[PDB]
Design an enzyme around this catalytic site. Structure first.
Site, PDB file in Angstrom:
ATOM      1  N   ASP A 124      81.165 -12.616  36.803  1.00 17.03           N
ATOM      2  CA  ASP A 124      82.058 -12.087  35.762  1.00 17.03           C
ATOM      3  C   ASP A 124      83.325 -11.486  36.376  1.00 17.03           C
ATOM      4  O   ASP A 124      83.774 -10.418  35.997  1.00 17.03           O
ATOM      5  CB  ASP A 124      81.302 -11.100  34.852  1.00 17.03           C
ATOM      6  CG  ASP A 124      82.037 -10.824  33.558  1.00 17.03           C
ATOM      7  OD1 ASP A 124      82.886 -11.660  33.181  1.00 17.03           O
ATOM      8  OD2 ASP A 124      81.764  -9.763  32.945  1.00 17.03           O
ATOM      9  N   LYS A 126      87.039 -10.867  36.830  1.00 17.98           N
ATOM     10  CA  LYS A 126      88.173 -10.897  35.921  1.00 17.98           C
ATOM     11  C   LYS A 126      88.936  -9.589  36.142  1.00 17.98           C
ATOM     12  O   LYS A 126      88.398  -8.638  36.702  1.00 17.98           O
ATOM     13  CB  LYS A 126      87.782 -10.999  34.430  1.00 17.98           C
ATOM     14  CG  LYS A 126      86.752  -9.966  33.989  1.00 17.98           C
ATOM     15  CD  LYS A 126      86.349 -10.224  32.543  1.00 17.98           C
ATOM     16  CE  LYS A 126      85.426  -9.129  32.016  1.00 17.98           C
ATOM     17  NZ  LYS A 126      85.041  -9.345  30.601  1.00 17.98           N
ATOM     18  N   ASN A 129      87.441  -6.194  35.504  1.00 22.48           N
ATOM     19  CA  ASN A 129      86.379  -5.802  36.419  1.00 22.48           C
ATOM     20  C   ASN A 129      86.836  -5.569  37.853  1.00 22.48           C
ATOM     21  O   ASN A 129      86.040  -5.395  38.760  1.00 22.48           O
ATOM     22  CB  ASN A 129      85.223  -6.822  36.396  1.00 22.48           C
ATOM     23  CG  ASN A 129      84.424  -6.762  35.112  1.00 22.48           C
ATOM     24  OD1 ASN A 129      84.467  -5.765  34.380  1.00 22.48           O
ATOM     25  ND2 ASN A 129      83.662  -7.816  34.846  1.00 22.48           N
ATOM     26  N   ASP A 142      81.151  -3.992  37.811  1.00 17.27           N
ATOM     27  CA  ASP A 142      80.383  -4.776  36.835  1.00 17.27           C
ATOM     28  C   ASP A 142      79.405  -5.754  37.479  1.00 17.27           C
ATOM     29  O   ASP A 142      79.565  -6.971  37.409  1.00 17.27           O
ATOM     30  CB  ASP A 142      81.296  -5.498  35.848  1.00 17.27           C
ATOM     31  CG  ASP A 142      80.573  -5.902  34.570  1.00 17.27           C
ATOM     32  OD1 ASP A 142      79.319  -5.817  34.536  1.00 17.27           O
ATOM     33  OD2 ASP A 142      81.254  -6.301  33.597  1.00 17.27           O
ATOM     34  N   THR A 164      82.550 -14.401  31.079  1.00 18.93           N
ATOM     35  CA  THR A 164      83.616 -14.170  30.109  1.00 18.93           C
ATOM     36  C   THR A 164      84.367 -15.479  29.954  1.00 18.93           C
ATOM     37  O   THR A 164      84.693 -16.144  30.930  1.00 18.93           O
ATOM     38  CB  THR A 164      84.548 -13.064  30.608  1.00 18.93           C
ATOM     39  OG1 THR A 164      83.807 -11.840  30.671  1.00 18.93           O
ATOM     40  CG2 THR A 164      85.753 -12.855  29.660  1.00 18.93           C
TER      41      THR A 164
HETATM   42  N1  LIG Z   1      83.923   3.507  38.646  1.00 17.78           N
HETATM   43  C1  LIG Z   1      84.809   3.641  37.662  1.00 17.78           C
HETATM   44  N2  LIG Z   1      85.929   4.364  37.781  1.00 17.78           N
HETATM   45  C2  LIG Z   1      86.798   4.436  36.758  1.00 17.78           C
HETATM   46  N3  LIG Z   1      86.635   3.828  35.574  1.00 17.78           N
HETATM   47  C3  LIG Z   1      85.532   3.087  35.349  1.00 17.78           C
HETATM   48  C4  LIG Z   1      84.543   2.962  36.399  1.00 17.78           C
HETATM   49  N4  LIG Z   1      83.545   2.153  35.976  1.00 17.78           N
HETATM   50  C5  LIG Z   1      83.855   1.818  34.694  1.00 17.78           C
HETATM   51  N5  LIG Z   1      85.038   2.364  34.346  1.00 17.78           N
HETATM   52  C6  LIG Z   1      85.636   2.151  33.024  1.00 17.78           C
HETATM   53  O1  LIG Z   1      84.645   2.186  32.000  1.00 17.78           O
HETATM   54  C7  LIG Z   1      84.605   0.945  31.270  1.00 17.78           C
HETATM   55  C8  LIG Z   1      83.206   0.544  30.821  1.00 17.78           C
HETATM   56  O2  LIG Z   1      82.366   0.402  31.957  1.00 17.78           O
HETATM   57  P1  LIG Z   1      80.886  -0.224  31.883  1.00 17.78           P
HETATM   58  O3  LIG Z   1      80.686  -0.976  33.175  1.00 17.78           O
HETATM   59  O4  LIG Z   1      79.912   0.854  31.456  1.00 17.78           O
HETATM   60  O5  LIG Z   1      80.974  -1.264  30.659  1.00 17.78           O
HETATM   61  P2  LIG Z   1      81.624  -2.738  30.730  1.00 17.78           P
HETATM   62  O6  LIG Z   1      80.552  -3.654  31.267  1.00 17.78           O
HETATM   63  O7  LIG Z   1      82.988  -2.659  31.374  1.00 17.78           O
HETATM   64  O8  LIG Z   1      81.875  -3.050  29.167  1.00 17.78           O
HETATM   65  P3  LIG Z   1      81.247  -4.331  28.408  1.00 17.78           P
HETATM   66  O9  LIG Z   1      79.749  -4.142  28.542  1.00 17.78           O
HETATM   67  O10 LIG Z   1      81.757  -4.189  26.994  1.00 17.78           O
HETATM   68  O11 LIG Z   1      81.808  -5.530  29.136  1.00 17.78           O
HETATM   69  C9  LIG Z   1      85.194  -0.074  32.226  1.00 17.78           C
HETATM   70  O12 LIG Z   1      85.742  -1.177  31.493  1.00 17.78           O
HETATM   71  C10 LIG Z   1      86.200   0.743  33.011  1.00 17.78           C
HETATM   72  O13 LIG Z   1      87.477   0.824  32.374  1.00 17.78           O
HETATM   73 NA    NA Z   2      80.909  -6.379  31.132  1.00 24.04          NA
END
Ligand SMILES: Nc1ncnc2c1ncn2[C@@H]1O[C@H](COP(=O)(O)OP(=O)(O)OP(=O)(O)O)[C@@H](O)[C@H]1O
Ligand code: NA
Length: 278
Positions: A124, A126, A129, A142, A164
Protein backbone atom coordinates in the site's frame (compact mmCIF):
# COMPACT_ATOMS: atom_id res chain seq x y z
CA UNK A 1 4.69 -2.48 30.04
CA UNK A 2 3.61 1.14 29.72
CA UNK A 3 0.04 2.20 30.54
CA UNK A 4 -2.32 5.00 29.43
CA UNK A 5 -1.70 6.97 32.64
CA UNK A 6 1.99 7.14 31.77
CA UNK A 7 1.10 9.71 29.06
CA UNK A 8 -0.44 13.13 28.55
CA UNK A 9 -2.43 13.08 25.32
CA UNK A 10 -2.63 16.14 23.09
CA UNK A 11 -4.17 16.67 19.68
CA UNK A 12 -5.49 14.07 17.31
CA UNK A 13 -3.01 13.68 14.45
CA UNK A 14 -5.25 11.58 12.25
CA UNK A 15 -8.00 9.02 11.99
CA UNK A 16 -8.23 5.74 10.13
CA UNK A 17 -11.11 3.44 9.29
CA UNK A 18 -10.92 2.09 12.85
CA UNK A 19 -7.95 3.77 14.46
CA UNK A 20 -7.09 7.17 15.86
CA UNK A 21 -3.57 8.57 16.15
CA UNK A 22 -2.94 11.00 19.02
CA UNK A 23 0.11 13.06 19.96
CA UNK A 24 1.26 12.02 23.45
CA UNK A 25 3.97 13.08 25.86
CA UNK A 26 5.40 10.43 28.17
CA UNK A 27 5.46 11.88 31.69
CA UNK A 28 8.53 10.08 33.04
CA UNK A 29 10.78 10.95 30.07
CA UNK A 30 9.12 13.99 28.48
CA UNK A 31 9.34 12.24 25.07
CA UNK A 32 6.75 12.81 22.35
CA UNK A 33 5.14 9.89 20.51
CA UNK A 34 2.35 9.37 18.03
CA UNK A 35 0.14 6.78 19.73
CA UNK A 36 -2.16 4.82 17.44
CA UNK A 37 -5.27 3.66 19.28
CA UNK A 38 -7.67 0.94 18.17
CA UNK A 39 -10.99 0.14 19.82
CA UNK A 40 -11.24 -3.54 20.79
CA UNK A 41 -15.03 -3.86 20.57
CA UNK A 42 -14.71 -2.67 16.98
CA UNK A 43 -7.66 -7.55 14.82
CA UNK A 44 -5.25 -9.49 12.57
CA UNK A 45 -4.40 -6.08 11.10
CA UNK A 46 -3.13 -4.70 14.41
CA UNK A 47 -1.22 -7.90 14.97
CA UNK A 48 0.23 -7.73 11.45
CA UNK A 49 1.24 -4.09 11.99
CA UNK A 50 2.97 -5.11 15.24
CA UNK A 51 4.76 -8.12 13.74
CA UNK A 52 5.95 -6.29 10.63
CA UNK A 53 7.09 -3.11 12.34
CA UNK A 54 8.83 -5.04 15.14
CA UNK A 55 11.12 -6.36 12.38
CA UNK A 56 12.13 -2.96 11.02
CA UNK A 57 15.10 -0.89 12.01
CA UNK A 58 15.93 1.65 9.30
CA UNK A 59 15.79 5.49 9.37
CA UNK A 60 13.21 5.75 6.56
CA UNK A 61 10.41 3.98 8.49
CA UNK A 62 8.18 5.03 11.36
CA UNK A 63 9.48 3.16 14.44
CA UNK A 64 7.36 1.05 16.78
CA UNK A 65 8.62 1.76 20.31
CA UNK A 66 6.07 0.06 22.55
CA UNK A 67 2.60 -1.36 22.79
CA UNK A 68 -0.03 -1.93 25.42
CA UNK A 69 -3.72 -2.53 25.93
CA UNK A 70 -6.56 -2.06 28.35
CA UNK A 71 -10.06 -3.54 28.41
CA UNK A 72 -11.25 -1.19 25.67
CA UNK A 73 -8.22 -0.28 23.50
CA UNK A 74 -4.97 -1.38 21.87
CA UNK A 75 -2.14 1.18 21.82
CA UNK A 76 0.90 1.35 19.54
CA UNK A 77 3.61 3.85 20.41
CA UNK A 78 5.20 5.18 17.25
CA UNK A 79 7.73 7.86 16.38
CA UNK A 80 6.02 11.19 15.70
CA UNK A 81 6.41 12.32 12.09
CA UNK A 82 6.02 16.04 12.73
CA UNK A 83 5.64 17.17 9.12
CA UNK A 84 2.85 14.79 8.18
CA UNK A 85 2.08 13.25 4.80
CA UNK A 86 4.11 13.64 1.63
CA UNK A 87 0.76 14.07 -0.13
CA UNK A 88 0.19 17.41 1.64
CA UNK A 89 3.34 18.83 0.01
CA UNK A 90 2.49 17.50 -3.40
CA UNK A 91 -0.92 19.20 -3.18
CA UNK A 92 0.57 22.38 -1.70
CA UNK A 93 3.29 23.04 -4.28
CA UNK A 94 1.55 21.18 -7.12
CA UNK A 95 4.63 19.27 -8.17
CA UNK A 96 8.29 18.86 -7.18
CA UNK A 97 11.29 20.25 -9.06
CA UNK A 98 13.87 17.77 -10.39
CA UNK A 99 16.20 18.03 -7.38
CA UNK A 100 13.36 17.36 -4.92
CA UNK A 101 11.88 14.58 -7.07
CA UNK A 102 15.29 12.94 -7.22
CA UNK A 103 15.96 13.23 -3.50
CA UNK A 104 12.60 11.89 -2.33
CA UNK A 105 12.51 9.13 -4.98
CA UNK A 106 16.01 8.09 -3.79
CA UNK A 107 14.86 7.88 -0.20
CA UNK A 108 11.85 5.71 -1.20
CA UNK A 109 14.13 3.47 -3.31
CA UNK A 110 16.50 3.12 -0.32
CA UNK A 111 13.61 2.24 1.93
CA UNK A 112 12.22 -0.35 -0.48
CA UNK A 113 15.66 -1.93 -0.91
CA UNK A 114 15.79 -2.42 2.85
CA UNK A 115 12.21 -3.69 3.07
CA UNK A 116 12.57 -6.12 0.18
CA UNK A 117 15.93 -7.29 1.58
CA UNK A 118 13.94 -8.46 4.63
CA UNK A 119 11.43 -10.27 2.44
CA UNK A 120 8.61 -7.85 3.20
CA UNK A 121 6.12 -6.44 0.67
CA UNK A 122 4.46 -3.15 1.60
CA UNK A 123 1.45 -3.43 -0.78
CA UNK A 124 0.00 0.00 0.00
CA UNK A 125 2.78 2.38 -0.92
CA UNK A 126 1.38 5.84 -1.70
CA UNK A 127 2.12 9.47 -0.71
CA UNK A 128 -0.42 9.32 2.15
CA UNK A 129 1.67 6.50 3.68
CA UNK A 130 5.00 8.28 3.33
CA UNK A 131 5.25 10.59 6.31
CA UNK A 132 7.91 13.28 6.95
CA UNK A 133 9.88 13.85 10.16
CA UNK A 134 10.90 17.23 11.52
CA UNK A 135 14.06 17.06 9.39
CA UNK A 136 11.98 16.31 6.24
CA UNK A 137 13.30 12.79 5.73
CA UNK A 138 10.69 10.16 4.88
CA UNK A 139 9.05 7.90 7.38
CA UNK A 140 7.08 5.12 5.66
CA UNK A 141 4.05 3.87 7.58
CA UNK A 142 0.94 1.68 7.33
CA UNK A 143 2.18 -1.89 7.74
CA UNK A 144 -1.09 -3.50 8.78
CA UNK A 145 -1.50 -4.68 5.19
CA UNK A 146 2.20 -5.53 4.59
CA UNK A 147 3.33 -9.15 4.29
CA UNK A 148 6.39 -10.97 5.57
CA UNK A 149 7.16 -13.57 2.89
CA UNK A 150 8.10 -16.93 4.39
CA UNK A 151 11.84 -17.64 4.07
CA UNK A 152 11.27 -21.35 4.80
CA UNK A 153 9.27 -21.79 1.58
CA UNK A 154 11.05 -19.11 -0.47
CA UNK A 155 7.61 -17.55 -0.85
CA UNK A 156 7.33 -14.90 -3.58
CA UNK A 157 3.57 -14.29 -3.89
CA UNK A 158 1.18 -12.93 -1.27
CA UNK A 159 -2.53 -13.78 -1.59
CA UNK A 160 -4.34 -11.14 0.52
CA UNK A 161 -6.22 -8.57 -1.60
CA UNK A 162 -5.09 -5.26 -0.18
CA UNK A 163 -4.01 -1.86 -1.55
CA UNK A 164 -5.30 1.46 -2.92
CA UNK A 165 -6.78 1.63 -6.39
CA UNK A 166 -4.51 4.35 -7.87
CA UNK A 167 -1.36 2.43 -6.82
CA UNK A 168 -2.41 -1.23 -7.07
CA UNK A 169 -0.46 -3.46 -9.38
CA UNK A 170 -1.85 -5.20 -12.43
CA UNK A 171 -0.77 -8.62 -11.12
CA UNK A 172 -2.91 -8.26 -8.01
CA UNK A 173 -5.91 -7.30 -10.12
CA UNK A 174 -5.44 -10.04 -12.74
CA UNK A 175 -3.52 -12.87 -11.03
CA UNK A 176 -4.90 -12.20 -7.50
CA UNK A 177 -1.47 -12.08 -5.81
CA UNK A 178 1.20 -9.42 -5.23
CA UNK A 179 4.98 -9.76 -5.03
CA UNK A 180 7.84 -7.43 -4.03
CA UNK A 181 7.77 -5.97 -7.56
CA UNK A 182 4.21 -4.80 -6.88
CA UNK A 183 5.82 -2.09 -4.68
CA UNK A 184 8.03 -0.98 -7.64
CA UNK A 185 4.84 -0.44 -9.71
CA UNK A 186 3.59 1.77 -6.88
CA UNK A 187 6.97 3.57 -6.88
CA UNK A 188 6.54 4.38 -10.56
CA UNK A 189 3.09 5.80 -9.84
CA UNK A 190 4.56 7.94 -7.08
CA UNK A 191 7.44 9.34 -9.13
CA UNK A 192 4.93 10.23 -11.86
CA UNK A 193 2.75 11.97 -9.25
CA UNK A 194 5.71 13.98 -7.89
CA UNK A 195 6.46 15.36 -11.31
CA UNK A 196 2.97 15.61 -12.91
CA UNK A 197 1.02 16.45 -9.77
CA UNK A 198 -1.45 13.57 -10.06
CA UNK A 199 -0.95 9.80 -10.21
CA UNK A 200 -1.02 8.29 -13.72
CA UNK A 201 -4.19 6.14 -13.56
CA UNK A 202 -7.14 8.40 -12.68
CA UNK A 203 -10.90 8.15 -12.69
CA UNK A 204 -13.89 9.02 -10.55
CA UNK A 205 -14.40 5.38 -9.53
CA UNK A 206 -12.18 2.35 -8.86
CA UNK A 207 -13.33 0.03 -11.66
CA UNK A 208 -12.36 2.62 -14.28
CA UNK A 209 -8.88 2.94 -12.70
CA UNK A 210 -8.48 -0.88 -12.70
CA UNK A 211 -9.38 -0.97 -16.38
CA UNK A 212 -6.67 1.60 -17.17
CA UNK A 213 -4.03 -0.10 -15.02
CA UNK A 214 -4.54 -3.47 -16.72
CA UNK A 215 -4.18 -1.88 -20.18
CA UNK A 216 -1.27 0.40 -19.18
CA UNK A 217 -3.41 3.34 -20.30
CA UNK A 218 -1.64 6.51 -19.26
CA UNK A 219 0.29 9.41 -20.80
CA UNK A 220 2.99 11.90 -19.77
CA UNK A 221 2.55 15.65 -19.79
CA UNK A 222 4.64 17.40 -22.45
CA UNK A 223 7.08 18.69 -19.87
CA UNK A 224 8.29 15.86 -17.67
CA UNK A 225 11.98 15.49 -16.76
CA UNK A 226 13.19 13.14 -19.50
CA UNK A 227 15.31 10.78 -17.33
CA UNK A 228 12.46 10.59 -14.83
CA UNK A 229 10.08 9.64 -17.62
CA UNK A 230 12.49 6.91 -18.69
CA UNK A 231 12.63 5.62 -15.09
CA UNK A 232 8.81 5.63 -14.83
CA UNK A 233 8.61 3.71 -18.09
CA UNK A 234 10.95 1.08 -16.62
CA UNK A 235 8.77 0.74 -13.51
CA UNK A 236 5.22 0.87 -14.99
CA UNK A 237 5.64 -2.39 -16.88
CA UNK A 238 2.77 -4.90 -16.85
CA UNK A 239 5.06 -7.91 -16.48
CA UNK A 240 6.20 -7.81 -12.82
CA UNK A 241 9.40 -9.67 -13.72
CA UNK A 242 10.51 -6.83 -16.02
CA UNK A 243 10.44 -3.81 -13.64
CA UNK A 244 13.76 -2.18 -12.87
CA UNK A 245 14.68 -3.17 -9.30
CA UNK A 246 12.90 -6.52 -9.24
CA UNK A 247 14.60 -9.84 -8.44
CA UNK A 248 14.34 -11.18 -11.98
CA UNK A 249 16.02 -7.94 -13.17
CA UNK A 250 18.88 -8.53 -10.70
CA UNK A 251 17.68 -6.26 -7.90
CA UNK A 252 18.37 -2.75 -6.60
CA UNK A 253 21.83 -2.27 -8.12
CA UNK A 254 20.51 -1.58 -11.64
CA UNK A 255 17.72 0.61 -10.28
CA UNK A 256 20.14 2.73 -8.23
CA UNK A 257 22.30 2.98 -11.33
CA UNK A 258 19.55 4.55 -13.49
CA UNK A 259 20.65 7.86 -15.10
CA UNK A 260 18.00 9.80 -13.14
CA UNK A 261 20.04 8.99 -9.99
CA UNK A 262 23.50 9.76 -11.38
CA UNK A 263 24.27 12.45 -8.81
CA UNK A 264 22.89 10.51 -5.83
CA UNK A 265 25.15 9.31 -3.01
CA UNK A 266 23.19 6.32 -1.75
CA UNK A 267 25.27 5.96 1.40
CA UNK A 268 24.09 8.06 4.36
CA UNK A 269 21.12 9.62 2.46
CA UNK A 270 19.48 10.03 5.84
CA UNK A 271 22.36 12.30 6.92
CA UNK A 272 22.02 14.69 3.95
CA UNK A 273 19.99 17.88 4.32
CA UNK A 274 16.85 17.49 2.18
CA UNK A 275 16.39 20.13 -0.51
CA UNK A 276 13.74 22.79 0.26
CA UNK A 277 10.50 22.09 -1.59
CA UNK A 278 10.00 25.70 -2.80
N1 LIG B 1 3.64 8.20 13.21
C1 LIG B 1 2.85 9.21 12.87
N2 LIG B 1 3.21 10.49 13.01
C2 LIG B 1 2.38 11.47 12.62
N3 LIG B 1 1.17 11.28 12.07
C3 LIG B 1 0.71 10.02 11.90
C4 LIG B 1 1.54 8.91 12.30
N4 LIG B 1 0.91 7.75 12.01
C5 LIG B 1 -0.30 8.10 11.49
N5 LIG B 1 -0.39 9.45 11.42
C6 LIG B 1 -1.58 10.12 10.87
O1 LIG B 1 -2.77 9.46 11.29
C7 LIG B 1 -3.53 9.00 10.15
C8 LIG B 1 -4.26 7.68 10.40
O2 LIG B 1 -3.31 6.67 10.73
P1 LIG B 1 -3.69 5.11 10.84
O3 LIG B 1 -2.48 4.36 10.34
O4 LIG B 1 -4.27 4.84 12.21
O5 LIG B 1 -4.90 4.94 9.79
P2 LIG B 1 -4.75 4.82 8.19
O6 LIG B 1 -4.46 3.37 7.90
O7 LIG B 1 -3.85 5.93 7.69
O8 LIG B 1 -6.24 5.19 7.70
P3 LIG B 1 -7.14 4.20 6.80
O9 LIG B 1 -7.30 2.96 7.65
O10 LIG B 1 -8.43 4.97 6.60
O11 LIG B 1 -6.36 4.01 5.52
C9 LIG B 1 -2.51 8.87 9.04
O12 LIG B 1 -3.15 8.98 7.77
C10 LIG B 1 -1.52 9.97 9.36
O13 LIG B 1 -1.89 11.24 8.82
NA1 NA C 1 -4.60 2.47 5.30
Amino acid sequence: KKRPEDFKFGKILGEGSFSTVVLARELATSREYAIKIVEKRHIPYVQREKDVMSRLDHPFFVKLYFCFQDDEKLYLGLSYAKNGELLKYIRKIGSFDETCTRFYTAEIVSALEYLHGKGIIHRDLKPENILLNEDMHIQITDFGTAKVLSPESKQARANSFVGTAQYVSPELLTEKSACKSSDLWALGCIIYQLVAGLPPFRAGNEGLIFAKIIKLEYDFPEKFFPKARDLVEKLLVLDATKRLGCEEMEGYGPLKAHPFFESVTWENLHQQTPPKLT
